[PDB]
Amino acid sequence: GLIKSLAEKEKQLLERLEAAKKEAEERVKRAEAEAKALLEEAEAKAKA
Amino acid sequence: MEKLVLAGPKGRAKELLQSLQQAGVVHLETLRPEALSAYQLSPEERAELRRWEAVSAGAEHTLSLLGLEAEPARPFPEGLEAAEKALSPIQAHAEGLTRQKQELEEELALAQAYLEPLERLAALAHGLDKSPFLRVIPFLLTEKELPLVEEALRKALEDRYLLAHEAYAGGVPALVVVHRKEVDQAKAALSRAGVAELRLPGALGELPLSEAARRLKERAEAAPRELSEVRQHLAKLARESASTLQSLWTRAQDEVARLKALEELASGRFGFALLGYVPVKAKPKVEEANPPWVKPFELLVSFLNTPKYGTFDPTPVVPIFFPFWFGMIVGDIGYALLFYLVGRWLSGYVKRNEPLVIDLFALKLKPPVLAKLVYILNWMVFWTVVWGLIYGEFFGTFLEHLGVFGTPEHPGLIPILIHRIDTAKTANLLILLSVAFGVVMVFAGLILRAYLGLKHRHMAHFWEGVGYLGGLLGILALAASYLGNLQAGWLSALMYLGFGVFLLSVVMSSIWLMIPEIFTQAGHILSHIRIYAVGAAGGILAGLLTDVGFAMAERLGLIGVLLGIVVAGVLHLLILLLTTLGHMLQPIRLIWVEFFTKFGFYEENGRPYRPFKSVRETQ
Amino acid sequence: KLEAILSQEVEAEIQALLQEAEAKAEAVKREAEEKAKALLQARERALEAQYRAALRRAESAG
């Protein structure tokens, strides 16, 4: 009858899940950038 | 808050919602089936359900073995772990005891049969059954077979065979003793007559006769004592722990039902569905939210509240039943008089039956729970017998009198000589008085029948239902022209012509493709008249059998007749009961002409909801 | 009613997960610091040897 109930939880649930994907991606990217950059210094220092 | 899930039907969406809304549950929102999908049980949930079934079944298994099964309404909340640990020692112990018991019983059954033959046979060739030099073969022969067998063996085996027999009370167990290597020949001779070798089951059969015979005699003596013990240990275990199993059974069953509920709701198998929220406090509160007339009415209120069609309350049924039902009892000499006594045995208690124990604690032929339900019924019977005693003096208006009829209140020879309900004028009016109620019921069903199509908003039912009621008027009209002739009923001889127009004139407005079938609508009218007539007249007939059962049917009547008639009277009682119970089915037979033909009633050819017969079973 | 709130019971499980993997995004970095570091302890000792060796040779030559 009321379509309103089932619509408005579905599209709040969809946002919760997308927002889970967001902070998972925005983290793995970072961790690799940090590790890349640590070792760059370890090459910069090693030769010097 | 606790999330709660609700279902109902589409038809009652508003009525269900209003009721739930009131009950405790708040925040009710509707959910369509596409929303319910994707909330089917996860594999873990299905494993709990599988396991809950095992516990349910597993109890039924243990509890049946141990003795009798009983299903209470009292569960005991426990874990998966707690319920399975409870169940495992008792099922194991009981499984073990029943197995011994079966072996003990089979052994007895064989040993009881075959001890006497093996004793006889062993005796005949004592100490020669374990020799290699001589071969023995046991076999049974009847008196009839003995000569044939002997001839056959004698020709086959010459005169160097030994045929011996010894009796046992009936036939003879016979033994033929033959040389080793003459075995095949010996066998062949038995086989041609159709007689074959006797060998028992297991080790005994294979043992020498002498061993087998000694051991069988021992088993018959030992078994009955050990059987007694195993049966005793098993009885104690039931006695102490039958309850434990029963309480697991109930609890386990509630959990199975809950998880099944969620899988059904999940596949979108309930059309109207709600979601709402209850605080922990509200959770109980949701589940929480003259005797003859009042008493059945208060239980019927549960059916007031759930309608299903354009139908009205199923409650007009009960006061139509009661006058007509009481008036099937009309005796006063050994019919209603005897029947008074019957009432007390169902509304009190007896022990004069075996399957029935004491009713006061709810123990009958019927299941113990069903017996507690039919207290109400038993009362409604008690009220019928009581009122029938009054309508037995109503009958005695038409019998007893000291001047009007030719039979006193109690003659001094024997009570009741000749019935005086054989006056022609007297029988006709009691039949015509009875007919009047049947007519009242014809109007009441078809008037509701029309109101049904008005508020169910199908004009085809409205139109058909209105028209058929015109025919009643014609039916009665026509009768008056014959009951009063032209002295009375010359006041309806001209309305009848027009009453006939009304029967057809409204029915045709719906058209209808079987116009003849209207004949059968007129059939239903006719029945209410005939059944009420049968209800009086057949009721009165009940009394007139009692003429020859507790009334003068010996000599000219005298002092001796009082205690002489009772020979025929007792024989007459069971005969009398069977035909008068046949009349008491008329109230329901009447009701069903109208009830299942949707005359302000729920039913109409099938459809869920019980016949009133089954409703009134408990009420 | 729980509707918008219905979504915060998931956002709390799916926040538990995302913290368990920011407890692995710390562990990974620990091991990688202890790796990067050890590659320069080997760098330190091997060079030290080659400087001990270079002055010793140059003394025997002198």
Swiss-Prot record, chain C:
Transmembrane portions of the chain: none
Keyword vocabulary terms for this entry: ATP synthesis, Hydrogen ion transport, Ion transport, Transport
Top-level lineage group: Bacteria
Keyword Transport recorded: yes
CC per GO annotation: proton-transporting two-sector ATPase complex, catalytic domain
Gene Ontology MF annotations: ATP binding; proton-transporting ATP synthase activity, rotational mechanism; proton-transporting ATPase activity, rotational mechanism
Keyword hit for Magnesium: no
GO biological process: proton motive force-driven plasma membrane ATP synthesis
Function: Produces ATP from ADP in the presence of a proton gradient across the membrane.
Family indicated by similarity: Belongs to the V-ATPase E subunit family.
Name the record gives this protein: V-type ATP synthase subunit E
Protein's organism: Thermus thermophilus (strain ATCC 27634 / DSM 579 / HB8)
First and last residues shown, out of full length: 3 to 64 of 188
